[PDB]
């Protein structure tokens, strides 16, 4: 009855904290919204957080619900 | 509650406004004394603040709880903000329906030169 | 036999039995049968070690069963080649780790309970011991 | 609003002496009045609910809100979002006119009227009675209807208990058997 | 399945068209979408075709 599975979507966090990225570079390839769009970081329809500016990634824990955010300090 | 329901209606436009990095004109309304102030993009301090609670504005009004009083605020904020050099701002309703005093405050600010 | 009423999934992994137990103190009763040796107790063994335990201390006294199986063990039929899937769940075991109080008794003399837990220890595979409820 | 002034002058002080309120605003006041006519039988006849929405326009003086089914339940054969009932929430000055017309001429005209119930409270301060006939009201001319369709009136107050809400409604003379 | 595919034809001079689907058995009216016609380049009221 079993024997079926999907093709791994290669999710996860591509660029980590302190890592210099470029404009448009994908920071996090996620399913839902584990990580949120902080500063200088957009959010696609795939809920994929990309970098809207040159700089470095900076994970944070702001908000009244301790939800994860991802900012970018221009470096 | 009537007060807390208003805060969630504001959150939509507050959070969207700081990512953009805009200088918002936060307008607070009340059955008496319509308030107003311009806050820097840092979200911490105000730069220009004018309302009817100031004796400089209330003493030139019939009642500090209506349209012509609200029109007196918008002109005052837009003329002292054009003193500090703050030209292009954003208008944050603070959850208030843009129709009466919150509309009159903008109309007085749009004509002064406050760009929005 | 102690068996779970409708668990979430029918079959489950083998899983290792490493570590030491948590339900170590005598809580409800005053005397216990702490398990010294690591192993796995079927629902047949727990049930069998109770009948010949609830016989030595008559209708009096109260016996607590600190263990519950909740782990299905598969068994392939005879003459069946390997593969073709997981077998059929036949019995339910309880992973017993060292220091797991198996039974607790209360309402009886200590020497009687000392002899009751000698009858039950002979029905279980794991090596046990007799422990006493300590003051904190 | 004839008996609204009756409230603002006599009823308030009448309650101030009975529970020594340290505020004039602490006195109970009836907030609103809801006229529920949850017909239900509209699954068979669509015009049945349409007629029910007409009688609320007569008993009250305003248009009713045809309510939809919150959840679909097959025990009664209804579905999610199917028009099942009609309510009228009247307040402002138009509630007092109804509140008067209710207890002055409508309540006395109730068939086999012995009295209301003093236990019909939700332990908070709200009163909820139910009428069986709709003809007890002046508007229904008896020769323009074909159903014994009655409704149930809920009276919401600003009380904090049924012990106190009973005191507010006592001043309006309410029969109360 | 039932949702067949049709062709939204521009009411302008050109024969440019946006193709799309439409449930025929449930919807009896035709589509009159105002879409951008890359030839005339304004925004023309398209109409359903096959």
């Amino acid at each position: 009855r079993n024997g079926r599975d999907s093709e791994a979507k290669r999710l996860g966090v591509k660029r980590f904290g302190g890592e210099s990225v470029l404009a448009g570079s994908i920071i996090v390839r996620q399913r839902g919204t584990k990580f949120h769009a902080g500063a200088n970081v957009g959010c696609g329809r795939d809920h994929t957080l990309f970098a809207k500016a040159d700089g470095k990634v900076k994970f944070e824990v702001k908000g009244p619900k301790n939800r994860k955010f991802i900012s970018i300090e221009a470096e | 509650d009537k007060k807390s329901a208003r805060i969630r209606r504001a959150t939509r436009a507050r959070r969207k406004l700081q990512e953009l990095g805009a200088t918002r004109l936060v307008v607070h309304r009340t059955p008496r004394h319509i308030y107003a102030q311009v806050i820097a993009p840092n979200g911490s301090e105000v730069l220009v603040a004018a309302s009817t609670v100031e004796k400089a504005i209330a003493e030139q009004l019939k009642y500090t709880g209506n349209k012509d009083a609200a029109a007196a605020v918008g002109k005052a904020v837009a003329e002292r903000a054009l003193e500090k050099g703050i030209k292009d701002v954003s208008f944050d309703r603070s959850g208030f329906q843009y129709h009466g005093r919150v509309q009159a405050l903008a109309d007085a600010a749009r004509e002064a030169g406050l760009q929005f | 036999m102690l068996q779970p009423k409708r668990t979430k999934f029918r079959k489950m992994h083998k899983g290792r039995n490493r570590g030491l137990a948590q339900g170590t103190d005598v809580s409800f009763g005053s005397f216990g049968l702490k398990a010294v040796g690591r192993g796995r107790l079927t629902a047949r063994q727990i049930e069998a070690a109770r009948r010949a335990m609830t016989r030595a201390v008559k209708r009096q006294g109260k016996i607590w069963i600190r263990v519950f199986p909740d782990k299905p063990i598969t068994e392939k039929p005879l003459a069946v080649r390997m593969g073709k899937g997981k077998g059929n769940v036949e019995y339910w075991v309880a992973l017993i780790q060292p220091g797991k109080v198996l039974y607790e008794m209360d309402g009886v003399p200590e020497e009687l309970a000392r002899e009751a837990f000698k009858l039950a220890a002979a029905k279980l595979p794991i090596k046990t011991t007799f422990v006493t409820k300590t003051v904190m | 609003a004839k008996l609204h002034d009756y409230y603002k002058d006599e009823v308030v002080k009448k309650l101030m002496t009975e529970f020594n309120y340290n505020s004039v605003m602490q006195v109970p006041r009836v907030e609103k009045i809801t006229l529920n006519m949850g017909v239900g039988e509209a699954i068979a006849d669509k015009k049945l609910l349409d007629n029910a929405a007409a009688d609320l326009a007569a008993i009250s003086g305003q248009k009713p809100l045809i309510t939809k089914a919150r959840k679909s339940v097959a025990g009664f054969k209804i579905r999610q979002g199917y028009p099942i009932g009609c309510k009228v929430t009247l307040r402002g000055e138009r509630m007092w006119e109804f509140f008067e017309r209710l207890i002055t001429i409508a309540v006395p005209r109730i068939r086999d009227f012995r009295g209301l119930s003093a236990k019909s409270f939700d332990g908070r301060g709200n009163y909820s009675m139910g009428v069986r006939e709709q003809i007890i009201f002046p508007e229904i001319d008896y020769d323009k209807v074909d159903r014994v369709r009655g409704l149930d009136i809920t009276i919401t107050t600003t009380a904090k208990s049924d012990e106190e809400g009973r005191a507010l409604l006592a001043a309006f003379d309410f029969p109360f058997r | 399945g039932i949702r067949e595919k049709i062709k939204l034809v521009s009411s302008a001079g050109t024969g440019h068209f946006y193709t799309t689907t439409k449930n025929k058995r449930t919807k009896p009216e035709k589509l009159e979408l105002k879409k951008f016609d890359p030839v005339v380049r304004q925004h023309v009221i398209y109409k359903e075709a096959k």
Partner: protein, 66 residues
């Protein structure tokens, strides 16, 4: 309120057969004729006749006559 959706709501003259003319707003039409108002309904005597009615000994003493 929303104009032109609610019925005609005009003041009328209501008067029961006890001289109690009471003017109130309604949606009836021109006027009204009442039967029993709240100041004339027999509720003040309603409880009296159903509660205190029983007794069989008093019934029987009108038969023994002595």
């Amino acid at each position: 309120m929303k104009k032109d959706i609610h019925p005609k709501y005009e003041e009328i003259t209501a008067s029961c057969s006890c001289g109690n003319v009471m003017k109130i707003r309604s949606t009836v039409g021109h006027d009204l004729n009442l039967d029993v108002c709240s100041k004339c309904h027999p509720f003040f005597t309603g409880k009296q006749r159903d509660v205190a009615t029983g007794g069989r000994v008093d019934r029987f003493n009108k038969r023994f006559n002595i």
